[PDB]
Amino acid sequence: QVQLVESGGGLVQAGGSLRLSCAASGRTFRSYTLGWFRQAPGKEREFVAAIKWSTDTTYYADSVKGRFTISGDNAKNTVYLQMNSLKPEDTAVYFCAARSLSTVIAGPEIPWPYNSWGQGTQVTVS
Amino acid sequence: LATRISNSGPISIAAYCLSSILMTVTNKYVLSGFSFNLNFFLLAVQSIVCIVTIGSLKSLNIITYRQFNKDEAKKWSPIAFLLVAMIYTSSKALQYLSIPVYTIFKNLTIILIAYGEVIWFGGKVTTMALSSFLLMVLSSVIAYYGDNAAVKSHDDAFALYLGYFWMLTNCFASAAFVLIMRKRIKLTNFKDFDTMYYNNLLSIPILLICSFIFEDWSSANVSLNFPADNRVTTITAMILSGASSVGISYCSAWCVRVTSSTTYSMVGALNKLPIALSGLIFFEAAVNFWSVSSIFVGFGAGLVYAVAKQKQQKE
Ligand SMILES: Nc1nc2c(ncn2[C@@H]2O[C@H](COP(=O)(O)OP(=O)(O)O[C@H]3O[C@H](CO)[C@@H](O)[C@H](O)[C@@H]3O)[C@@H](O)[C@H]2O)c(=O)[nH]1
């Protein structure tokens, strides 16, 4: 079984910093695009960030530009998502979604080409 | 109006080329995934769709094939097994390798087919054909270096080796299927579609059983393969893949009927380049000096061999 596991979620005071990870329990992220979504308590999933593993090209959401930083450490097959200056509205469950299709056919902000998903981790900011 | 399109030349080649691309892109979409493990189940669904599709056409009187006979299936089971081994190793090889690298690696099959015929079927290999076989070995070597130029860990290289193992096995399984099936077609006398009908009849039971023993059929694993949200897209990809196999078969018999067999051999070889580029556009594939030149050297090698067989059959 190949699953994506997130870690690092928790409760942080407003204006702090946090880090989230998305590891793999199986094959490598080669030739895949890893994205981070959030599901607020009573809203729909929202795009946060994404990264292309091989070429390391990152696409960021409109409202999290200059605050988050999605980076990838190639030595452990892990994808990180630094969060800085978190506002209270960031409270949501952060999912990690693997993908293979290209950005030409569908944009990086579209969920349907994402064929895998992790359980996610609760992030709360007060 | 339907008569006008039926005899058209350009339309017959466009339909075949678009159905070939459709088969590869949808098969690669489902196969790649991230947690996809049920390769036997996917092949079983595609075969079931093929049997339902041709069963529908024959009912409407668009395609004619034979009627199943038990005595006629006991003599075709060996080829059903060879089809199972060929498709499965083709799914594994495509799962780990990119579409371009897989396509050029598939040209190694005709080296085994052509040299397979000389030992048993009494054929021969002309100098042009031999010149091609060298170019497809060169393309294989270049592509191997193309993939290896992007692996920098213990993992991401064992994945490559698994891709090459399933590719090499698929080369020996496709050569065996072509040669043995040729030997037996003289005995059975299937002509146009009954060969596909029996292939997809026996392939269904074999794949379903092999999935039970080999693949993991559990509540957890099935959820990973088919997330509730992405069920609609994955199912539609599987259905389009199965119906694309029927589309290519009907459009291939269509192409031969209109533009003769001489143009169909060259259409199959020329169509390889669109199939390779479809991998770059639709999926993330490495682009560099080795990989790009590998597509054009492997394309030129296939074209030269096609002209070589065209010359050999001329005299
Ligand atoms: N991709 C794809 N190809 C298909 C499909 N269905 C059929 N084909 C391809 O369509 C062709 C059908 O050719 P056959 O009717 O199987 O002829 P053959 O056995 O390959 O004929 C060979 O032997 C003869 C006697 O030695 C030769 O006369 C002939 O030229 C050729 O070498 C093959 O290339 C086969 O792979 C399909 O769904 N998909």
Residue numbers in the entry:
A (entry chain B): 0 to 125
B (entry chain A): 48 to 362
Reproduce text from the manuscript describing this model:
GDP-mannose is a nucleotide sugar metabolite that serves as the substrate for glycosyltransferase enzymes that build the fungal cell wall. Nucleotide sugar transporters operate via a strict antiport mechanism, moving nucleotide sugars into the Golgi in exchange for the free nucleotide monophosphate, which is released back into the cytoplasm. Here, we present the cryo-EM structures of the GDP-mannose transporter, Vrg4, from the pathogenic fungus Candida albicans, in complex with nanobodies, in both the Golgi- and cytoplasm-facing conformations. NSTs consist of 10 TM helices that are arranged as two inverted topology repeats of five TMs, such that TMs 1–5 can be superimposed on TMs 6–10 via a 180° rotation in the plane of the membrane.
